[PDB]
Design a protein around this ligand. Structure first.
Ligand SMILES: CC[C@@H](c1ccccc1)c1c(O)c2c(oc1=O)CCCCCC2
Lengths: 99, 99
């Protein structure tokens, strides 16, 4: 597909079966979604950005269906205002920022 | 040009002549940079990042040169840890996200 930037690149993603609304963000180094349960085998992380830091729990190798493609990648859960898919997932998806 | 996102889409843009380094952000609606001092009309404003709020000054009708294309735009200045160009400028350039 081709996403125009006139609208927020918001898609529906299926992480381990659970349906989430995610914003595709090329400035996000990682991916952080809230409100999803992914197990009792995680790693405590801390990520910073504009305005401050946020504590997160990292889960590797997680099934992800988005844009009619399934990737296995690392995601972080935590109190974030909107669910973000950073570059770690976009590269795994084969996406590009074109001019 | 084409950005692969394996290494963070960062470029040099000139804001009314001053060169800065900015990250191309597809999730941000607005744009904010640290340090530039302009004179256009401005309004005090506060924004919310993925971790907290920051106090900004907002300028309108700002001449911006990026990737060899000139534009007239709205941008914000404040003590941000990372300079980003959001969708308001991205769209004026005609950039897109493909798969
Ligand atoms: C450039 C830093 C970036 C980021 C994202 C995730 C984790 C750390 C840093 C980031 C954005 O992409 C956006 C916003 O604030 C940010 O700090 C504004 C709020 C809305 C969310 C999308 C844009």
């Amino acid at each position: 597909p081709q996403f125009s930037l006139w609208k927020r690149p918001v898609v529906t993603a299926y992480i381990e079966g659970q349906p989430v609304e995610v914003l595709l963000d090329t400035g996000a180094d990682d991916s952080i979604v809230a409100g999803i349960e992914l197990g009792n085998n995680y790693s405590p992380k801390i990520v910073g950005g504009i305005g401050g830091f946020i504590n997160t729990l990292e889960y590797k190798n997680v099934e992800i269906e988005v844009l009619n493609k399934k990737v296995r990648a690392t995601i972080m859960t935590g109190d974030t205002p909107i669910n973000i898919f950073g570059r770690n997932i976009l590269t795994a998806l084969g996406m590009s920022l074109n001019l």
